[PDB]
Amino acid sequence: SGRLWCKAIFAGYKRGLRNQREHTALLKIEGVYARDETEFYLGKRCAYVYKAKNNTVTPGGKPNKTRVIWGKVTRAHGNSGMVRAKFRSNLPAKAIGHRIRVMLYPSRI
Amino acid sequence: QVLVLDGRGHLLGRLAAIVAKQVLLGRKVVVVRCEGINISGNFYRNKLKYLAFLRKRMNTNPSRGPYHFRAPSRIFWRTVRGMLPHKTKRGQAALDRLKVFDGIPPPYDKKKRMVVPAALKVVRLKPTRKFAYLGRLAHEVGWKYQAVTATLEEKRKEKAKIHYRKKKQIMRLRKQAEKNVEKKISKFTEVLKTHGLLV
Amino acid sequence: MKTILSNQTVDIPENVDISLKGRTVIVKGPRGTLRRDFNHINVELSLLGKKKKRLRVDKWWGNRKELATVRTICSHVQNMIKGVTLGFRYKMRSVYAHFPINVVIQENGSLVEIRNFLGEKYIRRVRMRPGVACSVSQAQKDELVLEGNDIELVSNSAALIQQATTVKNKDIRKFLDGIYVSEKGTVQQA
Amino acid sequence: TKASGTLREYKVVGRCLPTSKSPAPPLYRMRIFAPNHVVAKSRFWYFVLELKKMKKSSGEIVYCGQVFEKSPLRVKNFGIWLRYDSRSGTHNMYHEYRDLIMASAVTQCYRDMGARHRARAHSIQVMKVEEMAAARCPRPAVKQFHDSRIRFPLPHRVLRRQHKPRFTAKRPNTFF
Amino acid sequence: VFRRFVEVGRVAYVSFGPHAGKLVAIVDVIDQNRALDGPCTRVRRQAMPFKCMQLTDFILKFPHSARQKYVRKAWEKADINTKWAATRWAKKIEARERKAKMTDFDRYKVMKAKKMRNRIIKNEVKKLQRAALLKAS
Amino acid sequence: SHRKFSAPRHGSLGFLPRKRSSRHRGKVKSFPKDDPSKPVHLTAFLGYKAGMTHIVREVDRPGSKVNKKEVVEAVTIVETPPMVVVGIVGYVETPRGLRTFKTVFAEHISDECKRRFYKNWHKSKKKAFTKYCKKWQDDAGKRQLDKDFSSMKKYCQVIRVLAHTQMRLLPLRQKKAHLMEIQVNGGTVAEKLDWARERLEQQVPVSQVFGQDEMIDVIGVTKGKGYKGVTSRWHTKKLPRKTHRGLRKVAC
RNA sequence: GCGGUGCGCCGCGACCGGCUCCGGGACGGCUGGGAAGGCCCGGCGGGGAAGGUGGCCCGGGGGCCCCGGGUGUUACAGCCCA
RNA sequence: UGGUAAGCAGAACUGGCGCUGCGGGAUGAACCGAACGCCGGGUUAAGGCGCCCGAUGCCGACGCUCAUCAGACCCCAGAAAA
RNA sequence: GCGCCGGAGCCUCGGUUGGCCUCGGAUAGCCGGUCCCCCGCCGGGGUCCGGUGCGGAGAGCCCUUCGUCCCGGGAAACGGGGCGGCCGGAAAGGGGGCCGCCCUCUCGCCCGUCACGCACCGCACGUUCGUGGGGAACCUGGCGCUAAACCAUUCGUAGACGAC
């Protein structure tokens, strides 16, 4: 009936000032604003939900237009609740400042 | 989903530095009452700083040159514009989300306006330092519609005062009808206070 | 150093009843109510004792630029106390060499014309500040009188007629002529 | 030296590895205010060399222990005699501080000699730190705290924790 | 205009730091922005800055250099630990900690109460608005 | 190196987009500032330059060497047939500038005023204001037209009156009249709007705007002279005949 | 059934091992055999001064109720030391 | 060493650039860090951590400073006597 | 063959996964409550009481929904759903509030009894905003529209040519 994932923002890639490393993404999870509070979300699965033109098969039932690139919150970033997530396919940078879902279900509570 | 930030008392670059970053994270921001924004240091320094900005024009065709936007909304827009990569297609995707206003145009005059406390003159300046209202700056450097805005601004300062008077009037009825009904919500008040809502 | 505390008491009399609206001190008495706002100055204003016989201005953790903003507030309120009881009368006199300066008084106190200054055809309308009354005393030669409550507005309105009469493109050591502030006093006495 | 963190006061004694003339040279003690024991023994040789014909190689460090606080809960006046290198010549200064701890007051001195005069810990030479009677302290900056019934509010409470909402409804107060 | 003052014996409430949530008594003022003990609330005699302590309306009468034996006396004599707890500040401090420990089932048991406790007051406030309407017309 | 001998700059930069006027009928760029201590009046008119002739008059001024001697001064004739008011327009005051609120045209509009709404009058079926005019001959239409004044004397601040030139009373080739918004400056906004609505479908002569011996502003488009060169346009120095490619151009 | 090899594409859990950044436990060594402090009653005896507690005044805060100054080693608080 | 000096001319010692990417100093042959097969994980240097721009969104510590020409990072890019 | 009002499939743009309908504003001060009282046409004054690390809290509020049913208790009758008007707003106007009523029920909401719904056999983009945004169209109905621009010609207030 309700939402079973937390709001994250694909803010950027793991980048220096003049070099970006696309294989590691930076996830701004809404709610957590320090490394104090980042402890829960480490090792959690995080999905980039997008929809395209051509239909693709879905695990559960009928083929939708909606797709994902799956991920995994690797470890905490910076000092302000930013987190590093490493995706199985390196995210497209059209998704910069768009909604990707930090899930709950590599649960350890 | 939309930030409706108030501009009254906020600092020029401090609010810009926090707006510009939120908008890059795909948060639609509305900064309102930008005449209320003030800039640190005395007025005459900030006057000279913008007069120094006016003097900088493309010598061979000023119409091509730097567009010195004189409205406080567009002095706030341009200071945010400097804190965005406005050449790239992610940084122009940003500015399209930002929506800046002189006064409080509807539909934003009947929405609760948020405050950035990390960009506020009471929080960030000393009470013995000096500041410069963007209303006085813009007007004296060539903004026309301050005395237009300030009279439309004085309409809703009467209209919203009636709304608040009409809302205190309904909260007095709640501080009467929480009390008449105190005996038959007694089960429903305790469990709120065991888990710490009305304590 | 940051001086931990600096205070000075203004002993407000029985005839003058002052109050404070945050830090906007209002001063009423025999000849009008004077208000002045101190939003800028950043001090504690305490009105203590029954019948409120002393105002007390403090300054917690004040440096040298901010300790000098205590006795100014003392003297501001003390001038406010003076002007509310005794008033401010600035008797200013007309100095000339040859041409007698004709000063006629217009618009029930406010506007003051100055004819024939250094033999000039140009009449000079000087309006006084709102709440300052100008008069010319008789059986005299050369005398103006201002009358008011706020010292800020009486001298400001006197400075308007002292700088109305400046001698342009000359040696002002020889051409001494002009309307200058001769005497600083009050209307009625203690 | 680098006046890093809070300085620890070390007692460093030492003497000359023996001559045929003097079989046992005199033991020389010093109050060294150092971040750690390693640089305390380095700063020991600096001053002793300035005073005697006692270098590091023609000498030995005998004891190196931190002289701790004998009253770290009592508020005390401290009078530090300085010798700092300005951009033109050196100057003898007498400065006064107010701390529980001697080493903390010399830490509080190193920041202050940097703050007001832009002198670094290499320029500065702390020659004497003497705990002072409350009536023997000249500066009014430290004297002003010598009132039995001292009483001040915290007038303009500039709130920190500014980025905990980052976006709020209420304008924050400062008359707490 | 000020009510609370940094005076020897004032109970101040430690907001942040390692002693966040404990009461402390101001024994002596060291500096402009640094003070010097809360013997009954498990706070050792220590130097601590003014920034971290939110100073209350409790002064308990003992001298500035007095050792921790004579802080504990004037503390318990004034009876601060029970005088604190009954104040509406201390109550909403330990209402904040209850709402923190609100279990997902406790979140349910309050929500079902929230609804029925507010489903009545929308009815009852509306009936009060006829008491404003009956007098007019 | 520097300018050897100083000269004032040829022409002004205070108009320098020297292009074809974007409007043939000269727009009033700004109307006079008003104070409601005056009566209601039209602030402008719309005339046609007929020609140019002499005068003889006795100069009434102290001091001059031509004190009550006869001056032959040049005068223009502007044929000003009395304009007909066919509408009113409200302008609300916005912080983005000044926005038009609502245009309310009159019941009947003359065929000369109709022509201005068209390009090809001959080819058209002339159907303009056939369904707008119907809001005047039914009581259902009237109340909205009255509510368009009820919701204009309240909201709007600047009120201008739509007038047109009566092209019938001119010796010109053309018939297509010239519309113009004349700002009604004078008393309060309700008094101003209860005035112009009474003046709707009515004649406005020139005596009821302009009085004699009055200084006024003439807003007219300059006479077109086509693609003229820099010595013809900017009035620079001609080069001294020995020049190769031309002597009627700017050197540097 | 027992070994070997592998899944059509898409996924997933598991324990072991390598290397990792952490987090919480718990034990101990040394020191001026830590310095301080806590609790035992400020163990008996002075003496010292002060950022002077009590007692006496001065002006003012009241229908006699408390702060500012001055006194001085004790007093209905405390501080340091011999 | 010559020359008032020079991004000038001429030596010594080493290290560079040339022949060489790389991280930083916005930019730059030489400066600072560090020299390179192709990659994933981790950690650093020199430098930074309002925003562009990864990183202080620490409830960082104590002072200093008002500029009607503010100040702001080796080489390095605006000043003296007074 | 088009405009407003009232079936079923296909194309294609993707982002989103409960909303907060508002005092003004102060900062060495504020917030909310009221008799003696001056005005303004019920407010705004002085007064007095409470809140003040803001609990009439954005550290927040409201709303939170597996569903259905029978049997009882709290709770609602001043309510619940859907028509005609009643009436509120121009700065970038709004979809609200309130009443009469044709009107349908004592269901919603809080406990507890009692029962069942592909119980899809440990597993993914589920869950909404969404009768979304634009794009050709198809059935089937009502109520209403019949224009203009450009060229060509002409002018000469215009003009290199266009434009005007």
UniProtKB/Swiss-Prot annotation, chain A:
Disulfide bond sites: none
Compartment(s) where it occurs, according to its Swiss-Prot or TrEMBL record: Cytoplasm
Main location (coarse class): cytoplasm
Superkingdom assignment: Eukaryota
Modified residues (N6-acetyllysine): 7, 62
GO cellular component: cytosolic large ribosomal subunit; synapse
InterPro entries in alphabetical order: Ribosomal_eL33, Ribosomal_eL33_CS, Ribosomal_eL33_sf, Transl_B-barrel_sf
Modified residues (N6-succinyllysine): 62
Any one Gene Ontology molecular-function term assigned to this protein's record: tRNA binding
PROSITE patterns membership: RIBOSOMAL_L35AE
GO biological process: translation
Complex and partners: Component of the large ribosomal subunit.
Protein family per UniProt: Belongs to the eukaryotic ribosomal protein eL33 family.
Main function: Component of the large ribosomal subunit. The ribosome is a large ribonucleoprotein complex responsible for the synthesis of proteins in the cell. Required for the proliferation and viability of hematopoietic cells.
PANTHER family linked: 60S RIBOSOMAL PROTEIN L35A (PTHR10902)
Full protein name: Large ribosomal subunit protein eL33
Provenance organism: Oryctolagus cuniculus
Swiss-Prot record, chain C:
GO CC terms in record: cytosolic large ribosomal subunit
GO MF annotation terms: rRNA binding; structural constituent of ribosome
UniProt keyword annotations, A-Z: Acetylation, Cytoplasm, Ribonucleoprotein, Ribosomal protein
InterPro entries: Ribosomal_uL6-like, Ribosomal_uL6-like_a/b-dom_sf, Ribosomal_uL6_a/b-dom, Ribosomal_uL6_CS2
Coiled-coil ranges (or none): none
One GO-annotated biological process of the protein: cytoplasmic translation
Compartment list: Cytoplasm
Residues the record lists as N6-acetyllysine modifications: 121
Main localisation: cytoplasm
Subunit structure: Component of the large ribosomal subunit.
Function: Component of the large ribosomal subunit. The ribosome is a large ribonucleoprotein complex responsible for the synthesis of proteins in the cell.
Family: Belongs to the universal ribosomal protein uL6 family.
Name of the protein described by the UniProt record: Large ribosomal subunit protein uL6
Species of provenance: Oryctolagus cuniculus
UniProtKB/Swiss-Prot annotation, chain E:
Cross-link type Glycyl lysine isopeptide (Lys-Gly) (interchain with G-Cter in SUMO2), residue numbers: 122
GO CC, one annotated term: cytosolic large ribosomal subunit
Positions carrying Phosphoserine: 137
Compartment(s) where it occurs, according to its Swiss-Prot or TrEMBL record: Cytoplasm
Sorted UniProt keywords: Acetylation, Cytoplasm, Isopeptide bond, Phosphoprotein, Repeat, Ribonucleoprotein, Ribosomal protein, Ubl conjugation
Modified residues (N6-acetyllysine): 77, 83
Residues recorded as bearing N6-succinyllysine in the entry: 83
Biological-process GO terms, alphabetical: ribosomal large subunit biogenesis; translation
Broad class of where this protein is predominantly found: cytoplasm
GO molecular function: RNA binding; structural constituent of ribosome
Highest rank taxon of the organism: Eukaryota
Function summary: Component of the large ribosomal subunit. The ribosome is a large ribonucleoprotein complex responsible for the synthesis of proteins in the cell.
Protein family: Belongs to the eukaryotic ribosomal protein eL14 family.
Quaternary structure (record): Component of the large ribosomal subunit.
Protein name as it appears in the record: Large ribosomal subunit protein eL14
Species in which this protein is naturally found: Oryctolagus cuniculus (Rabbit)
Gene: RPL14
Swiss-Prot record, chain F:
Modification sites for Phosphoserine: 12
Cellular component GO terms held in the UniProt record: cytosolic large ribosomal subunit; nucleolus
Positions of the UniProt region annotated as Disordered: 1-36
Broad class of where this protein is predominantly found: nucleus
Domain of life from the UniProt record: Eukaryota
N6-acetyllysine modification, residue list: 135
Coiled coil: none
UniProt-recorded Gene Ontology molecular function terms: RNA binding; structural constituent of ribosome
GO biological process: translation
Glycyl lysine isopeptide (Lys-Gly) (interchain with G-Cter in SUMO2) cross-link site: 38, 223, 225
Protein function: Component of the large ribosomal subunit. The ribosome is a large ribonucleoprotein complex responsible for the synthesis of proteins in the cell.
Family recorded in the similarity comment: Belongs to the universal ribosomal protein uL3 family.
Assembly information from the UniProt record: Component of the large ribosomal subunit. Interacts with DHX33.
Name of protein: Large ribosomal subunit protein uL3
Organism, as annotated: Oryctolagus cuniculus (Rabbit)
Organism taxonomic ancestry: Eukaryota, Metazoa, Chordata, Craniata, Vertebrata
